[PDB]
Amino acid sequence: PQITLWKRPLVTVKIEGQLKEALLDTGADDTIFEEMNLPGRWKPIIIGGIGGFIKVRQYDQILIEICGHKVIGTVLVGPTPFNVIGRNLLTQIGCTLNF
């Protein structure tokens, strides 16, 4: 689908049987989510953004279904004010910016 930018690019995602809206963020290298449980072992990491840094739990090989499209990749879990889909996953769906 084509998405304009007059409103926040929210999309519903299915991840670990959980339904959530997520922000298609081209400014995000990686995908981070609010607190929720996921499969496998994880590494603690710190990510930097506007205003400072936050500690998050790093998880690899996470299944997310995004607007009917399937993807697997790294998903970080931490105190983000919003769920964002970063570029690590936007690529796999062939998402592009266009103007």
Footprint of ligand 017 (CB under 6 A)? 25, 27-30, 32, 47-50, 81-82, 84, 86
* Contact characters 7-36, a copy of itself, x per CB under 8 A: -xx-------------xxxxxxx--x----
* Residue 45 makes contact with a copy of itself by CB under 8 A: no
* Residue 62 makes contact with a copy of itself by CB under 8 A: no
With a CB cutoff of 8 Å and minimum separation 6, the contacts of 2 are 98
What is the CB neighbour count within 10 angstroms for residue 81? 8
20-40 residues labelled b (16+ CB within 10 A) or e (exposed): bebbbbeebebbbbeeeebee
The token pair that represents 25 in the structure block: 């963020």
Q: Compute CA 73 distance to the chain's CA centroid, rounded to the nearest angstrom.
A: 10
Looking at beta carbons only, is 10 or 63 nearer to ligand 017?
10
Binding a copy of itself by CB under 8 A: which of 1, 17, 40, 44?
1
Helix (H, G, I), strand (E, B) or coil at 94: coil
Residues of this chain that interact with a copy of itself (CB under 8 A) are: 1-6, 8-9, 23-29, 32, 47-54, 69, 80-82, 84, 87, 90-91, 93-99
The residues that are catalytic are: 25
